Amino acid sequence: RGQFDVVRPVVRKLVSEMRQNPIDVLYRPKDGARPDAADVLMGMYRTD
Amino acid sequence: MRHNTAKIAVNIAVREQIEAGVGAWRLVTDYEDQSPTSNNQVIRREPI
Numbered sequence: 179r180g181q182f183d184v185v186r187p188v189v190r191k192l193v194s195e196m197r198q199n200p201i202d203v204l205y206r207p208k209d210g211a212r213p214d215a216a217d218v219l220m221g222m223y224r225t226d
Numbered sequence: 227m228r229h230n231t232a233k234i235a236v237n238i239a240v241r242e243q244i245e246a247g248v249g250a251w252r253l254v255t256d257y258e259d260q261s262p263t264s265n266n267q268v269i270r271r272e273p274i
Contacts, residue, residue: 208228210262 227271228261235273250274 203223205216227233235251242249251273258268 229270231273232271235271238273 203220205219207213207215239249239251251271253269254272255267255269257266258270259266261268
């Protein structure tokens with residue numbers, strides 16, 4: 179029993195690309211609300 | 227439309243347009259104070 183196992187360099191390559199380009203919480207403000215509410219929420223998000 | 231249900235609706239409709247040749251979305255009526263408006267009634271884009 180022998181295997182090339184060609185799925186792994188394809189999967190592992192895409193895994194490296196999403197880690198170096200992470201998508202994380204930010205908060206941009208909404209209409210009808212203060213523009214400086216962004217750092218209020220992030221202030222306590224980044225600490226815990 | 228601050229909630230993701232609006233942005234998810236665009237991404238569903240473009241995929242089905244190419245793939246199946248059809249696609250659509252609805253506009254629904256509800257009572258929402260989490261998105262404030264005059265007298266707190268909003269409409270949202272719900273995908274099909």
